[PDB]
Symmetry: C2
Subunit: 177 residues, 2 copies
Amino acid sequence: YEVELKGYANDEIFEKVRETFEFMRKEIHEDIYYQHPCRDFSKTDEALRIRIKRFNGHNEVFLTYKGPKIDEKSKTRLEIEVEIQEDVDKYFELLDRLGFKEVLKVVKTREKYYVEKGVTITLDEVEGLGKFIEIETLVKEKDEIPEAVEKLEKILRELGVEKFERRSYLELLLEKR
Amino acid sequence: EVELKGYANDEIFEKVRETFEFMRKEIHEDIYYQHPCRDFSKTDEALRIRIKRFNGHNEVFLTYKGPLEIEVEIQEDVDKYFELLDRLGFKEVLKVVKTREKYYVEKGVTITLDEVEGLGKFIEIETLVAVEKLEKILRELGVEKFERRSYLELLLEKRTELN
């Protein structure tokens, strides 16, 4: 599982990260989140998204399904992700035909930083929400999530993060609709 | 995409091989799905993952058929696509296996000789724009019984009557 924690940020936290960790790369993300044709994802805590990632003149697109959060202390959830290598428009059309309707588009910039082996921090500037900081690392077993969460929470708090958020950017933006 | 299908047999298959230019032979396994809440059998829609084998390799496609077709190639992680479909509520209805031989008739016209597991031999013809033209071609090959129902539909009907 990809253990992930998110906190609200600011110029202070952003700068500290830039002066503490190795910069990997900056990406622009344009996500389109969908609603299921038969069930309310907001009630089942699921998500389906198409993400367009832009960096270094490159463009990558991914279709990702996210399962319900399984941890009370983090945003960790099961994920199934495939890369759309071509015909991006066809995937958009396929989802539409199957009844998946766009709920909202989330746009942000993300600066990725190397923390330690398998641990990455991202500085996010989300349109319509502001600055956030995320941290993630992979774990094999579900029972390993608690330890990882503690480790990642410590890293973020040591950077100045005080307010954590388990709600997705999508949920946060929907609240402001 | 104007397409027609007819019941075939060894003779019809043979006539095709002698008359038209062989293009390619492929083996297909089509995994058809039911929509999480729309009954595709009532909305005249379909969604399938096709795994084709030809020229020593496999190619995978995800295709939606409207009541008019969206097809994308799965170059990697087909297992993830199976999982994604399951997670989204799509359920396997039936897996259709067939061997297909494609033949070139003329500019923009192709014929396929299909040996469908559990159903038998069929011949399909397709072109882009026409029906009377393709119809005549098939009739001259000895085709006497056409079929608008898909292999999936036929296999399901066959199962229902058999039980």
